[PDB]
Amino acid sequence: LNVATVTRRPEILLVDSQEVILQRLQQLLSPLPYTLHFARDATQALQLLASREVDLVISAAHLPQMDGPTLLARIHQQYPSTTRILLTGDPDLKLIAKAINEGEIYRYLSKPWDDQELLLALRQALEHQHSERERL
Amino acid sequence: RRPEILLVDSQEVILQRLQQLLSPLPYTLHFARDATQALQLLASREVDLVISAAHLPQMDGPTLLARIHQQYPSTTRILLTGDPDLKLIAKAINEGEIYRYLSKPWDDQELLLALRQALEHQHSE
Numbered sequence: 001l002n003v004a005t006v007t008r009r010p011e012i013l014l015v016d017s018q019e020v021i022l023q024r025l026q027q028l029l030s031p032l033p034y035t036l037h038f039a040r041d042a043t044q045a046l047q048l049l050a051s052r053e054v055d056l057v058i059s060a061a062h063l064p065q066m067d068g069p070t071l072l073a074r075i076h077q078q079y080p081s082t083t084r085i086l087l088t089g090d091p092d093l094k095l096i097a098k099a100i101n102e103g104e105i106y107r108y109l110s111k112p113w114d115d116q117e118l119l120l121a122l123r124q125a126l127e128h129q130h131s132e133r134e135r136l
Numbered sequence: 137r138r139p140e141i142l143l144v145d146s147q148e149v150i151l152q153r154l155q156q157l158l159s160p161l162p163y164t165l166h167f168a169r170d171a172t173q174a175l176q177l178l179a180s181r182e183v184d185l186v187i188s189a190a191h192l193p194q195m196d197g198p199t200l201l202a203r204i205h206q207q208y209p210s211t212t213r214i215l216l217t218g219d220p221d222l223k224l225i226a227k228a229i230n231e232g233e234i235y236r237y238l239s240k241p242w243d244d245q246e247l248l249l250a251l252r253q254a255l256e257h258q259h260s261e
């Protein structure tokens with residue numbers, strides 16, 4: 001076989017009800033070689049995940065049906081191939097603790113974020129996802 | 137084999153309390169009061185799980201946990217701290233890749249659960 005080069009393009013799901021956040025994410029990420037999906041509540045996120053492979057989910061902390069840490073906890077158990085990131089400006093460490101202890105997030109990012117910090121977390125998360133998928 | 141747990145906290149009283157909580161269980165315990173002692177133990181003992189405070193006299197807890205992630209990647213790491221500082225917690229996630237974060241004073245039932253889950257996670261990783 002030929003040397004391995006590229007898999008299919010990364011698939012990223014962004015979950016937030018706030019339009020400013022979805023817009024800032026689209027502006028930052030759409031020029032890069034990723035397939036993006038946007039979900040405006042937890043139920044939409046879960047339905048998207050049931051319908052296609054997703055490499056990375058980035059969720060807000062606050063969402064309509066269940067909060068972000070709760071959503072990420074469900075995703076951890078039901079979609080273990082998807083790497084998980086919490087994106088929030090809420091400093092509540094009870095919510096953060098849930099994201100760690102139940103969501104098992106790979107990275108935590110603040111709102112607002114530094115663009116290059118977020119892009120680096122994304123690279124690290126996609127590389128982690130690929131290495132983990134090489135395993136199981 | 138028997139799980140090996142390293143406990144890192146600046147205070148004798150806290151190490152004593154962890155020893156009392158954990159000595160009934162079939163775990164081999166190691167104790168450190170700072171990052172230098174933790175690193176000495178890590179180089180001289182098999183360690184599966186590391187539990188660290190956030191505040192330590194020199195190199196702090198999240199920095200120590202990041203160093204352990206880099207140098208001893210097969211370990212599972214827990215931050216156990218009384219300081220709800222977002223900056224410390226964020227570093228413990230993004231650089232330490234902690235498995236659990238618990239506040240001090242802890243709930244015994246929750247801390248013991250975290251260890252059982254960590255050992256089951258440590259087992260398969």
